[PDB]
Every structure is written in structure tokens, then in C-alpha cells.
């Protein structure tokens with residue numbers, strides 16, 4: 314089996330497995346994560362292999378864990394909290410986000426015709442920019458750790474009980490988030506992540522809209538190649554649309570960095586009305 318790591322190891326009986334969250338991941342309660350508060354129960358997410366899993370499933374699960382150990386903590390990513398590795402099935406314990414992924418979160422907050430609400434309080438203008446800011450801060454951290462996401466999208470951002478945005482699945486139809494060069498040449502970089510972030514911004518200001526509506530996958534390259542970009546969302550400022558457009562620069566060296574996006578978003582947030 315797999316070697317013990319006491320920095321992360323939690324005894325199996327410290328975990329009370331609860332309800333399934335999605336496929337596999339379960340909600341649970343962890344007893345004594347903090348060695349200094351050993352009688353407190355914390356709600357956590359636990360990832361385990363499905364009953365029909367292959368050896369590449371196991372080894373991928375291990376690599377995810379190992380990778381998350383190296384990346385370190387940041388408030389705007391989903392953080393590693395612990396693991397059960399010895400007494401039986403591998404369990405990887407990470408932070409729980411009670412409000413689900415950002416796509417569902419936004420859709421549930423649509424006003425009740427051309428983008429119906431599939432379920433909450435609408436999000437103010439400032440809240441939407443602030444959501445963008447947080448995602449960018451998380452991506453800025455990951456980039457500073459030399460971590461390339463490769464599948465950044467609103468589905469891969471989760472939202473906590475306190476509405477903190479946390480990048481998900483950074484340790485591993487998705488073609489609609491891929492930079493042209495990722496698609497064509499399978500060249501993945503921080504710069505391709507910035508492309509994906511611009512699609513994510515479009516998602517934010519469409520309140521979970523589907524990118525490139527009606528465009529079949531097999532034509533998307535040619536179109537992008539030809540200068541096709543998505544139209545401004547109806548309720549998006551010209552300035553935030555220019556950001557999206559910059560993220561979608563054809564030349565990857567000409568895209569802004571996440572460092573820059575964070576600074577730009579920090580200022581826009583400060584200037585954006587809470588009243589809207």
C-alpha cells in the first residue's frame with residue numbers, strides 16, 4: 314500500500330461519513346482536525362475511489378493528494394485538510410463548500426425569460442465583480458506556485474457558506490474554455506488559464522450562461538482562428554468586456570497575467586456600485 318505521512322494523517326474513526334455530494338465525494342464531519350481544538354467537529358468533503366475503480370484511478374487520486382500537499386494553503390482555493398491512508402480505503406479530506414459550484418450558485422440567483430432560473434437573493438453588481446476578484450486571487454496564488462489548472466471554469470469554482478470563492482480541481486463540453494493553442498497544439502500554460510478565466514468572467518456576468526450558444530464544437534477552432542469571440546453579456550460593463558477580450562487575445566504573450574487581473578479587479582470592485 315501507501316506510505317504514512319503524519320503531517321496529514323487523520324485516524325479513520327475521527328471521520329463520520331455523511332451524505333453523497335457528487336461523483337466520488339461525500340460530506341463528513343471530522344473530529345479534532347485542529348490538534349489544539351481536539352473536541353470540535355468540522356464539516357469537510359472527503360474524496361474516495363468508486364467501487365469499480367481502476368489502478369489509474371487510485372494513482373491519480375494519490376497524485377492529486379500529493380500535489381495539493383505541495384501547493385500550500387490559500388483562502389481562494391479548496392484546501393487539503395487531511396487523509397486516511399492506512400486503515401483501509403484511501404480518503405482525501407478537503408474543505409467543504411456548502412453553496413456548491415459557482416455555475417449553479419449564479420443560476421440559482423437569476424431573476425425569474427431568456428435565461429430562466431432552474432431552482433435565492435439576486436447578486437448585486439459589486440458581488441459579481443467581487444466573485445471575479447476572488448477567483449482571480451485564487452488563480453494568482455496557483456500560478457505563483459507554478460500550477461497550471463487546464464480546466465478553469467465556473468463549474469470548477471466552489472462557494473462556501475460564507476460565499477468565499479475557492480478554485481476546485483487544480484491538482485489533476487470543456488473545449489469551450491480552452492485557449493486556441495490548447496486546443497490545437499495541446500500547449501497548456503498560465504496564459505491558457507487566463508483565456509479560460511475570460512470565459513469564466515463571461516459565465517459570471519451571464520449568471521451561469523452557456524458559452525458559445527448553438528456553436529457546434531467542431532467549428533469552434535476555425536471560428537476562434539478567424540477572430541470569433543463571444544459577444545458582451547447584456548449586463549456587463551464595457552470595461553469588464555474589454556478584460557474578457559484581453560484574456561482572449563490570440564497571441565498568448567499578450568494576455569494579462571493573473572497578477573494584473575487581480576490589480577484591475579481590485580480597483581473595479583472598489584468603483585462598482587453596491588446599489589445596482
Ligand SMILES: CNc1ncc2c(n1)N([C@H]1CCN(C(=O)/C=C/CN(C)C)C1)C(=O)N(c1c(Cl)c(OC)cc(OC)c1Cl)C2
Pocket residue numbers: 334335336338358359360377378391405406407408409410411412413414417468471480481482483484
Ligand atoms: C458541493 N460541495 C463541495 N464541497 C467541496 C468539494 C466538493 N463539493 N466536491 C465536488 C462534489 C460535487 N461537486 C459539485 O459541484 C456538484 C454539482 C451537482 N449539484 C447538484 C450540486 C463538487 C469536490 O470535488 N471537491 C474536491 C475534492 Cl473532494 C478534492 O478531493 C481531493 C479535491 C478538490 O479540488 C482539487 C475538490 Cl474541489 C470538494
